[PDB]
Paper text:
Crystals of A. aeolicus NuoEF contain two NuoEF heterodimers per asymmetric unit. Both monomers align with a root-mean-squared deviation (RMSD) of 0.17 Å for all atoms and will consequently not be discussed separately. NuoE and NuoF are very similar in structure to their homologues in T. thermophilus, Nqo1, and Nqo2, with a RMSD of 0.93 Å for 334 Cα atoms, in accordance with their high-sequence identity. However, our model of NuoEF contains 985 water molecules that are not detectable in the structure of the T. thermophilus complex I due to its lower resolution. However, the detailed analysis revealed that a single peptide bond, between E95F and S96F, undergoes a reversible flip, such that its carbonyl group points toward the flavin in the oxidized state, while it faces the loop coordinating N1a in the reduced state. This peptide bond is located in the active site of the enzyme between the FMN cofactor and cluster N1a. In addition, two conserved water molecules are present in the active site in the oxidized state of NuoEF. The disulfide bond between C144 and C172 found in T. thermophilus complex I24 is not present in the A. aeolicus ortholog.
Numbering used by the authors:
A (entry chain A): 5 to 160
B (entry chain B): 3 to 418
The structure:
């Protein structure tokens, strides 16, 4: 019943043809699925397993293991907030407070329109520019609420 | 057009790995070629794989990923086994405070690519991989584009520069697990499986990817390979102290005036890194502690140590996180405990339960909700994460926290 749109299926086949073995493309495929839907739809796992020539249980275990993948909440933009040591030291709590003031949500929550989800994450590798956050693939240093508000207004 | 990347400050006294990466922008193949780029590859292809291994061995280059294994020796172990062989560039990074690898990837990708080609030729690998953490999407797109540029210039594909040497570099992405930086879990992830570390021996150099001889090297280790070929092993050995030679990248963060990456010789002291290079502390406050990533904790009395691989040296990956006099050590220890709780793969029972309990009990201590039993339990679990552990994570999950208990007892005591 569930079938990937041709535009996405083409992208998935491209990843499957990229590595010497089909099964090596599993994570690139799941990144592609999440980038398209704004989450991993549970129903997408069976046709993906078929394309990768892997059992469904294998694919389910992989999705559960790699925590960048979200099977529960659909969100257009994932605000990944570093909660590790350097960012904590430099102002994670100020960034989280500014996010709540602007968006009305706390970590783990999604805005009512399904536009933004705050995702607490471990060290993003930009510690010198702490406190760090990402908005999908874009990464930034949080400076203040006014600066953060201008950044978020670019995601429509 | 690539996704937004923060503009990490970078400075060098050696002008080697940061010759271009000191500028916060992508340096494409034409700019790399203008600096004499890919000429070390051409020289390498006129040498035998065995001579390249000899040069890399004689240079004294040691792994930059944390274990510090001599690179030339690792390659020597791999080629003692029959082919096909695989070469893997470990770009998982992800340790708290560590951001040295991404600046090579995102600003000077051809330096890494050239090093991967030379290394693959040295070990007879015709298939190479870059495994980059999923949270570096710009690095991924930059590498895919740079690999295409290298292919079009004839530095990749079949019969490279008429040498008969074939090579394809595939870029794989991680998807959230710190454990995927551990070389065996990285290999499992490349096979399309969960990043679960495997028991060693067998070591990857004997049985790695698809059970074949596999060399895994860190981004920074590989970035040195074009310099050893270009300068020759003897001239490379002249850089820094003769016992820990070559350039080293130091990611400095926390309470410093100029946080960023510093390319320095390994005879530089920790005090010089902070005060001479990183501009001293924020507000000129006293250094309280230096966290060597999530691995070690050094007190203000240990700043005159060298930034090398010596037993009394800084060690680790040269990751410098500075805490000053007002930073609460218990709150800082909690963040380290939370990191290990989140990243244990859970295969080993004392690691699985110990990383979880260490963080859960430390949170109770921090919030003032800990009973006398919770304090004793916390002390016990911190000393018991390592038993039966398959990989390095279980062996170090309690290390930094134990050093804070030994070096800052008065601060811990005010929570009791
Ligand atoms: C839990 C754990 C995580 C690791 N993460 C990394 C990492 O992100 N990057 C890295 O190059 N090495 C990492 N290592 C070390 C690798 O297993 C391996 O020693 C290294 O990639 C070999 O390259 P090198 O000899 O050039 O240092 C990690 C080790 C452990 C135990
Ligand atoms: S020591 Fe910890 S991280 Fe390593 S394999 Fe065992 S459970 Fe996983
Ligand atoms: S601690 Fe937040 S990016 Fe490293
Ligand atoms: Cl099935
Ligand atoms: Cl020559
Ligand atoms: Cl290791
Ligand atoms: Cl005991
Ligand atoms: Na990863």
């Amino acid at each position: 019943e569930f079938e990937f749109p041709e535009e996405l299926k083409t992208k998935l086949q491209e990843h499957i043809n990229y590595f010497p073995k089909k099964r090596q493309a599993i994570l690139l495929c799941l990144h592609e699925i999440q980038n398209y839907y704004g989450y991993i739809p549970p129903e997408s796992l069976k046709p993906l397993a078929d394309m990768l020539e892997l059992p469904l249980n294998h694919v389910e275990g992989v999705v559960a293991f790699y925590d960048m993948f979200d099977r529960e909440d659909k969100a257009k933009y994932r605000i990944r907030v570093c909660v590790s040591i350097v960012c904590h030291l430099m102002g994670t709590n100020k960034l989280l407070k500014a996010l709540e003031n602007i968006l009305g949500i706390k970590p783990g929550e999604v805005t009512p329109d399904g536009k933004f989800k705050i995702v607490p994450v471990q060290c993003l590798g930009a510690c010198s520019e702490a406190p760090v956050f990402m908005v999908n693939d874009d990464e930034y240093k949080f400076e203040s609420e006014v600066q953060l508000n201008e950044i978020l207004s670019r995601y429509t | 057009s690539y996704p937004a990347i923060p503009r990490i400050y970078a400075e060098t006294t050696l002008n080697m790995l940061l010759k271009r990466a000191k500028k916060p922008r992508v340096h494409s193949i034409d700019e790399y070629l203008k600096d004499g780029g890919y000429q070390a590859l051409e020289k390498a292809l006129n040498m035998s794989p065995e001579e390249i291994i000899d040069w890399v061995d004689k240079s004294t280059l040691r792994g930059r990923g944390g274990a510090g294994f001599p690179t030339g020796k690792k390659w020597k172990f791999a080629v003692q086994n029959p082919g096909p062989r695989y070469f893997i560039c470990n770009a998982d990074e992800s340790e708290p405070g560590t951001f040295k690898d991404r600046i090579i990837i995102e600003r000077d990708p051809h330096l890494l690519i050239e090093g991967i080609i030379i290394s693959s030729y040295a070990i007879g690998a015709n298939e190479a991989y870059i495994y980059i953490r999923g949270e570096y999407p710009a690095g991924y797109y930059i590498l895919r584009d740079a690999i295409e540029e290298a292919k079009k210039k004839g530095f990749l594909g079949k019969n490279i520069l008429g040498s008969g040497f074939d090579l394809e570099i595939y870029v794989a992405r991680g998807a959230g697990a710190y454990i995927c930086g551990e070389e065996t879990a990285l290999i499992e992830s490349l096979e399309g499986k969960r990043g679960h570390p495997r028991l060693k021996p067998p070591y990857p150099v004997q049985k790695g990817l698809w059970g074949k001889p596999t060399v895994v090297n860190n981004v920074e280790t590989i970035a040195n390979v074009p310099f050893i070929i270009s300068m020759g092993w003897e001239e490379y050995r002249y850089i820094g102290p003769s016992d820990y030679a070559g350039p080293k990248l130091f990611p400095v963060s926390g309470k410093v005036k100029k946080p960023g990456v510093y390319e320095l010789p390994m005879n530089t002291t920790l005090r010089e890194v902070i005060f001479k290079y990183a501009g001293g502390t924020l507000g000129n406050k006293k250094v309280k502690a230096v966290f060597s990533g999530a691995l070690d904790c050094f007190s203000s009395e240990e700043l005159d140590i060298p930034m090398d691989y010596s037993p009394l040296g800084f060690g680790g990956t040269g990751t410098v996180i500075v805490l000053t006099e007002e930073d609460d050590i218990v709150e800082a220890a909690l963040k380290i405990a939370e990191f290990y709780e989140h990243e244990t793969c859970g295969q080993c029972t004392p690691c699985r339960v110990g990383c979880y309990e260490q963080a859960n009990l430390l949170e109770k201590i921090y919030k003032g909700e800990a009973t006398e039993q919770d304090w004793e339990g916390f002390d016990f679990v911190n000393r018991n994460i390592q038993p039966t552990s398959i990989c390095g994570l279980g062996a170090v999950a309690g290390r930094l926290i134990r050093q804070t208990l030994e070096k800052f007892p008065e601060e811990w005591e005010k929570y009791r």
